[PDB]
Design a protein around this ligand. Structure first.
Ligand SMILES: Oc1ccc2c3c1O[C@H]1c4[nH]c5ccccc5c4C[C@@]4(O)[C@@H](C2)N(CC2CC2)CC[C@]314
Ligand SMILES: CCCCCCCC/C=C\CCCCCCCC(=O)OC[C@H](O)CO
Ligand SMILES: CCCCCCCC/C=C\CCCCCCCC(=O)OC[C@H](O)CO
Ligand SMILES: CCCCCCCC/C=C\CCCCCCCC(=O)OC[C@H](O)CO
Ligand SMILES: CCCCCCCC/C=C\CCCCCCCC(=O)OC[C@H](O)CO
Ligand SMILES: CCCCCCCC/C=C\CCCCCCCC(=O)OC[C@H](O)CO
Ligand SMILES: CCCCCCCC/C=C\CCCCCCCC(=O)O
Ligand SMILES: CCCCCCCC/C=C\CCCCCCCC(=O)O
Ligand SMILES: CCCCCCCC/C=C\CCCCCCCC(=O)O
Ligand SMILES: CCCCCCCC/C=C\CCCCCCCC(=O)O
Ligand SMILES: CCCCCCCC/C=C\CCCCCCCC(=O)O
Ligand SMILES: CCCCCCCC/C=C\CCCCCCCC(=O)O
Ligand SMILES: CCCCCCCC/C=C\CCCCCCCC(=O)O
Ligand SMILES: CCCCCCCC/C=C\CCCCCCCC(=O)O
Ligand SMILES: CCCCCCCC/C=C\CCCCCCCC(=O)O
Ligand SMILES: CCCCCCCC/C=C\CCCCCCCC(=O)O
Ligand code: NA
Length: 408
């Protein structure tokens, strides 16, 4: 209510300076006056702790009284067709606004300024995530393809995470541009690509982590039975099944993703069939369930039992060297899974809150928090290759060898 009044007041001052004619000035003055009278009835957030009779609230009201009277005088000029004189009076309005109202409401366009500062912060973070995650995950993929010692079932699942992570990080410079420009300049096909990739990363990542966790559970807790379940070839086939299952959501996203005009700009968005708010809500609930709660419950059972096994048995296999290896690989999986949960839980919860709950969605701290949770979800992509290199001696060694011989 007050926020909107303050913007309209300030926006219309600008219209007046830009006006071609008296009618445009009269119209803008008329809106400024309406906005001013509404603002005058309200309490600034800063003054919530004060009496209506305090020197602060007296001052705030006095300012709008002065402003309204100046608008009344300028309207008489505009009504009589005197555009230059009307425009000149709008200059005096800035003085009043600055001396009395900005005191309490903050600088005009402070909200816009925060939006821009956030977009610049997002761009910087997204550029870092993109560089580390794209380059890092491409190396992981080439490394696994190149080396025989790298083709283990666990690492075939890691290949799947890397593919998703490479795709997602490749979108980030486009998303940055969108945030800075406050519009989508890239056309509909790229919109479909970016939205689809975004959802495929979300679904394939968690499906892959669930299968990695089950695979590791089998390896650690059922080592004899494991021979009948675990091979690199089987993990590769499960990866394909993961992408096919994820396409259940992916292909509908591909179809529904469109560019639409919205408030002078172009938005890249999902067009749900009617009633759109309903299918949006159903989809968000299903994402919360099947991309977050359900796989995390599965993983938690496997995770807890792996922890119990690791402390309840002296040796997981024949030799201390190999035991050590199985324990190290298991720890790496547990860290990767843990890092995923820490990076993605905040945004999963926040999407549900934003969609279903009556929060203040235009509040800058709430918007910044939301965007930081989104960024944290992407940052998981850049984190992973770093985790693999520090937690698995074979990744470290094969990263070095790949770089020694890029072409063999
Ligand atoms: O239902 C989802 C649950 C979690 C996420 C999303 C979901 O629908 C997308 C979506 N709609 C929103 C509506 C209001 C506020 C935020 C979002 C997001 C965030 C996000 O863009 C994000 C997360 N990306 C992934 C990105 C964090 C790395 C995947 C797609 C999407
Ligand atoms: C989307 C473009 C990128 C998609 C590229 C997918 C590459 C997956 C891959 O490399 O598959 C290995 C397979 O075993 C081949 O023999
Ligand atoms: C498939 C599993 C791996 C995928 C990895 C993600 C990469 C997505 C890349 C490009 C999407 C381009 C989409 C091409 C456009 C076809 C959809 C379409 O035409 O939309 C219908 C229209 O909007 C109303 O009916
Ligand atoms: C709920 C999350 C379950 C993950 C399902 C999955 O990863 O599917 C792979 C394949 O279909 C398994 O045979
Ligand atoms: C319906 C549409 C479904 C189409 C699935 C096709 C491509 C998506 C990418 C699939 C990637 C599968 C995993 C590749 C892999 O594991 O490669 C390891 C590499 O070969 C080292 O051994
Ligand atoms: C499983 C693989 C594909 C199934 C998805 C089939 C694709 C059909 C999706 C159609 C749809 O979701 O509606 C689009 C409409 O244009 C609203 O914007
Ligand atoms: C330290 C690494 C990441 C922390 C991210 C802090 C970004 C603050 C955003 C500033 C803003 O709101 O404009
Ligand atoms: C470079 C990698 C990370 C730092 C980016 C996050 C800080 C951005 C601050 C910019 C701003 O507040 O205007
Ligand atoms: C905005 C969309 C841009 C998407 C494309 C850029 C991201 C590229 C991602 C993955 C391609 C890398 C595949 C490397 C696997 C090794 C292939 C092989 O050697 O057989
Ligand atoms: C990693 C992928 C490569 C990153 C480089 C991409 C650069 C991104 C954005 C630059 C912005 C250019 C604006 C696009 C103009 C589209 C138009 O014609 O309207
Ligand atoms: C870019 C910001 C990313 C911040 C994410 C922080 C990542 C660390 C998160 C969780 C680590 C979980 C540790 C799991 C313990 C291993 C169990 C064990 O081996 O006994
Ligand atoms: C919020 C959840 C954050 C991280 C999930 C992983 C936490 C690891 C628990 C400790 C494992 C252990 O006992 O060593
Ligand atoms: C995990 C812990 C749950 C985290 C966050 C839940 C926050 C619920 C939001 C309450 C806001 C109430 C409101 O604004 O109407
Ligand atoms: C690693 C586990 C962390 C999980 C905690 C999740 C916290 C982020 C999720 C939701 C926060 C929602 C906050 C909404 C504040 C409402 C303010 C308002 O408008 O009144
Ligand atoms: C995750 C952190 C989310 C917390 C956001 C709190 C904002 C409350 C507010 O602005 O009133
Ligand atoms: C970057 C973010 C986290 C990096 C964590 C590095 C893990 C170091 C552990 C080394 C080891 O266990 O041998
Ligand atoms: Na991912």
């Amino acid at each position: 209510d007050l926020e909107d009044n303050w913007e309209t007041l300030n926006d219309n001052l600008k219209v007046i300076e830009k006006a071609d004619n008296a009618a445009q000035v009269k119209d803008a003055l008329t809106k400024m006056r309406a906005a001013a009278l509404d603002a005058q009835k309200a309490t600034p957030p800063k003054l919530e702790d004060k009496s209506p009779d305090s020197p602060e609230m007296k001052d705030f009201r006095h300012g709008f009284d002065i402003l309204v009277g100046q608008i009344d005088d300028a309207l008489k000029l505009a009504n009589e067709g005197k555009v230059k004189e009307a425009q000149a009076a709008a200059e005096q309005l800035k003085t009043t606004r600055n001396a009395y109202i900005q005191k309490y409401l903050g600088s005009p366009g402070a909200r816009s300024a925060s939006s821009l500062a956030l977009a610049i912060a997002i761009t910087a973070l997204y550029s870092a995530v993109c560089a580390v995650g794209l380059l890092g995950n491409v190396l992981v993929m080439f490394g696994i393809v190149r080396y025989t010692k790298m083709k283990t079932a666990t690492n075939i699942y890691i290949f799947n995470l890397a593919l998703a992570d490479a795709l997602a990080t490749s979108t980030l410079p486009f998303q940055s541009a969108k945030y800075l420009m406050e519009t989508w300049p890239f056309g509909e096909l790229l919109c479909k690509a970016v939205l689809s990739i975004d959802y495929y990363n979300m679904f394939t990542s968690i499906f892959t982590l669930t299968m990695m966790s089950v695979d590791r559970y089998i390896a650690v807790c059922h080592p004899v039975k494991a021979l009948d379940f675990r091979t690199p070839a089987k993990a590769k086939l499960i990866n394909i099944c993961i992408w096919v299952l994820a396409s259940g959501v992916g292909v509908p996203i591909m179809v529904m993703a469109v560019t639409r005009p919205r408030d002078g700009a172009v938005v890249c968005m999902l067009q749900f069939p009617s009633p759109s708010w309903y299918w949006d809500t159903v989809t968000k609930i299903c994402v919360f369930l099947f991309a977050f709660v359900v796989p995390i419950l599965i993983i938690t059972v496997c995770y807890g039992l792996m922890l119990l096994r690791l402390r309840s048995v002296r040796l997981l296999s024949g030799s201390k060297e190999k035991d050590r290896s199985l324990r190290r690989i298991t720890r790496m999986v547990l860290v990767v899974v843990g890092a995923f949960v820490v990076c993605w839980a905040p945004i999963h919860i926040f999407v549900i809150v934003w969609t279903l709950v009556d929060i203040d969605r235009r509040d800058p701290l709430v918007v910044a928090a939301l965007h930081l949770c989104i960024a944290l979800g992407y940052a998981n992509s850049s984190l992973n290759p770093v985790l693999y290199a520090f937690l698995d001696e074979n990744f470290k060694r094969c990263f070095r060898q790949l770089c020694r011989k890029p072409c063999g």
